[PDB]
Amino acid sequence: QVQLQQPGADLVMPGAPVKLSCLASGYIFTSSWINWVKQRPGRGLEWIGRIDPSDGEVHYNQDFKDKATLTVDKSSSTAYIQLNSLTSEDSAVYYCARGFLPWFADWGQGTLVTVSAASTKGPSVFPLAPSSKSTSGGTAALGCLVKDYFPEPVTVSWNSGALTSGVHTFPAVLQSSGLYSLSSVVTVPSSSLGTQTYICNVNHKPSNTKVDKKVEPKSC
Amino acid sequence: NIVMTQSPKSMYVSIGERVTLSCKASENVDTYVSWYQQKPEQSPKLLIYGASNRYTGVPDRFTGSGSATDFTLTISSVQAEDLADYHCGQSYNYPFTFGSGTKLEIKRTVAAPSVFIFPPSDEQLKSGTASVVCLLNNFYPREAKVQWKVDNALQSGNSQESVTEQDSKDSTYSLSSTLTLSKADYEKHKVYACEVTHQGLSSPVTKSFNRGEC
Numbered sequence: 001q002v003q004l005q006q007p008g009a010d011l012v013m014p015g016a017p018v019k020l021s022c023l024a025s026g027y028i029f030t031s032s033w034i035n036w037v038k039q040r041p042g043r044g045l046e047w048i049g050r051i052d053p054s055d056g057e058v059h060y061n062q063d064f065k066d067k068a069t070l071t072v073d074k075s076s077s078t079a080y081i082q083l084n085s086l087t088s089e090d091s092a093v094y095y096c097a098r099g100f101l102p103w104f105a106d107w108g109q110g111t112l113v114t115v116s117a118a119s120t121k122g123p124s125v126f127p128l129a130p131s132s133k134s135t136s137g138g139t140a141a142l143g144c145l146v147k148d149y150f151p152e153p154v155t156v157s158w159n160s161g162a163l164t165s166g167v168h169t170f171p172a173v174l175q176s177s178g179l180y181s182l183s184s185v186v187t188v189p190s191s192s193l194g195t196q197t198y199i200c201n202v203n204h205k206p207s208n209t210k211v212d213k214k215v216e217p218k219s220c
Numbered sequence: 221n222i223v224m225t226q227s228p229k230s231m232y233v234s235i236g237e238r239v240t241l242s243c244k245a246s247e248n249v250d251t252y253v254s255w256y257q258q259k260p261e262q263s264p265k266l267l268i269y270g271a272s273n274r275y276t277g278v279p280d281r282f283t284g285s286g287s288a289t290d291f292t293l294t295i296s297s298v299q300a301e302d303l304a305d306y307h308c309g310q311s312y313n314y315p316f317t318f319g320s321g322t323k324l325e326i327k328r329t330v331a332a333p334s335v336f337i338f339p340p341s342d343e344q345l346k347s348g349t350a351s352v353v354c355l356l357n358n359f360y361p362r363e364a365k366v367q368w369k370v371d372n373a374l375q376s377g378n379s380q381e382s383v384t385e386q387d388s389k390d391s392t393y394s395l396s397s398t399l400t401l402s403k404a405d406y407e408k409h410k411v412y413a414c415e416v417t418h419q420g421l422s423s424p425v426t427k428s429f430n431r432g433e434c
Contacts, residue, residue: 045256045264045307045318061315095263102311103254103269110263126344128353131336133434141336141355145344145398170382170396183382183396185355187334218339220434 002026002106004034004098009112011151015085020111022096024077030054032098034079036070039110040092050099051079091115114151118178122207123149125200128183129218132190140193142215143168143185144200148177154204156184163188163198193217222246224253226308226319232327232361233298241322243291243308252312253291255284259304268293298324328391332420333359337413337427340406350406352399354414354427358392366397367415367424375399407431 004023012018022034036048049060051070058070071080079096094111097104123146132140146154156169163186172182184200199214223246233239243253251271256264266275271291272284281296295302303326308319334357340350354366362383368375381397397414410430417424 044320045309047315047317059314063315093263101269102252103266103309104264104311105266105269105275107263107265124344124347126341126351128338128355129341131338131355135336141334141357143338143353143355145341145351145353147344147351168384168394170384170394173380173382175380181351181380181398183353183398185357185394185396187357218434 002098003108004096004106005108006094006096006111009114011114011116012086013117014087014115017082017084018086018113019071019080019082020094020096020113022079022108024053029074029077032100033057034070034072035097035099035104036068036081037095037097037104038064038092039095043092048081048094053077053079086113086115088115088117116150116178118150120206121148121150121179122209123147123154123182123202123204123211125202125211125213127213127215128185129215130193132193132217136190138190139166139187140190141185141187142193142198143183144202144213144215146172146182146184146202146204148175148179148181149204149207149209150179151206152180154180154182154202154209156182156203157201158184158186159199160201221315222249222310222313222317224308224310224317224319226306226322228322229320230323230325232325233295233303234327235299236297238294238296239298239324241293241295241306241308243286243293243319245289245291245310247313248288249310249312251287252310253286254309254311255293256307256309257304258307264307295324325386326391328360330420331358331360331392333357333364333395333416333418335414335416335425335427337429339412339429339431345403345406348403350401350403352412352429354397354399354416356395356397356416356418358387358390358394359418359420360392361419362393363419364393364395365417365424366395367417368397368399369411369413369415369426370399371409371411 033050038046097107126145128143167186169184172180227242255268258264268284307321336355379399383395413428415426
C-alpha cells in the first residue's frame with residue numbers, strides 16, 4: 001500500500017512562492033527518487049525534477065532549474081517542490097511520482113495550482129429565455145448564464161435536482177477580466193413551457209452565492 | 221530535447237475494435253518509451269514500461285512494441301474503461317519527455333446540430349453588458365463552427381465558445397458561442413445572426429434575432 005499523494009489545490013497571486021508536498025506509504029523514503037511533473041490544462045505532461053531522499057541529490061529540468069527547488073524530508077517522509085515567483089502561465093496541476101526503476105510506477109493525486117490576482121466575487125445569473133419561435137419543433141431551449149465569478153466552482157442544478165435530463169452545464173471560461181463565465185442549458189418540450197415551471201439553481205460557494213433564478217418564456 | 225511525437229492527436233474508435241496509437245522519438249531512445257493511461261479526473265497510470273512490458277495489473281488486452289524511433293500502443297479491443305487519454309513517455313536522456321498525448325473517443329453516426337439564439341436579458345443590459353449566446357445542440361463529430369454576424373458585419377475576437385465532451389448517453393457534443401459587447405455598442409445594431417457550419421448540415425444554418433420584434 002505504498003502510495004504517495006499530494007494536497008487538493010490552492011490559489012495564489014502572481015510572483016508568489018508556493019510549497020507542495022508528497023508522501024511515502026511503506027517501502028523507504030530513501031529507496032527511490034521522486035519526480036515532479038507539470039501537467040498544464042489540455043497539454044502533455046512536462047518534467048520538472050528528481051531529488052534523492054538521502055543525499056538529497058537533485059536533477060532539475062533545465063527549464064525549471066532557476067524557478068523551482070526540490071526540497072526534501074527524511075525526517076517526515078515527504079518531498080516538497082517550491083516555485084519562486086509564479087506567473088499566470090504557471091497555473092497547472094502538479095504531480096510527484098515514485099520512480100520505481102528509471103520509470104514512474106506509482107504517482108499521487110494532482111495538486112491544482114491556480115495563479116490569479118482576482119478577488120473572490122459572486123456570479124450573476126441571467127435568463128436564457130425560451131427559444132421556440134421556428135424552434136417550436138417539439139422541444140424548445142432555455143438556460144442560465146452565470147457570469148463573472150471567482151473562483152471555481154459554481155454548481156448548477158435545475159429544479160433542486162428534479163430535472164436531470166437534457167441539462168448541459170457547459171465548462172466555465174476565463175474572460176479577459178480574470179472572472180469566469182459558465183452557462184447551463186436544458187432542452188425541454190415546446191408544449192411544457194407553461195405546462196411546467198423551470199428554475200435553475202446556481203451556487204458559487206466561496207462568495208457564498210446561492211441564487212435561484214427562474215427562466216420562463218419571453219414576452220416577445 | 222528528445223522530442224516525442226504522438227499520432228493521431230485524437231482518434232474515434234468503436235467499442236470492441238483493435239486500435240493502434242503512434243509515437244516516434246526524435247533521436248533513438250532504445251526501447252525506453254513507456255505508456256500512461258489517464259482518465260480526466262485521474263492522474264496518469266503506467267500500463268507499459270520498457271518498450272513492451274505490461275506493467276503489473278495491466279490487462280492482456282494492452283500490448284506494446286517498438287525499437288528505436290517508432291513505437292505503438294495497441295489496445296487489442298476497446299471497452300468502456302479503455303476510452304481515455306494516452307501519453308507516450310521516455311526516460312533514457314535528461315530531461316525525460318512526454319508526447320502531447322492522444323484522446324480516445326467512441327464513434328457513431330453524424331448528427332446535424334440544433335441551433336438556438338438567445339437575446340441578452342434586460343437585467344444583464346442595465347449594468348453595461350450584452351451577452352448573446354448561440355446554442356449548437358447535440359451534433360457529431362466535434363468539428364463544428366459558429367459564425368457571428370452583427371448587421372451583416374463579421375465579428376472577430378469578441379466571442380468565446382465552449383464545448384462539452386461526449387454525452388454519456390447519446391455520445392454527442394455541444395457548444396456555446398457567447399458574444400459580448402457593451403449595452404451601447406449593442407443598441408447600435410438591430411440584427412444579430414449566428415451561422416453554424418457543420419459536416420452534418422447540407423448548408424450552414426443561421427439563427428437570427430432583432431432587438432424589439434420577434
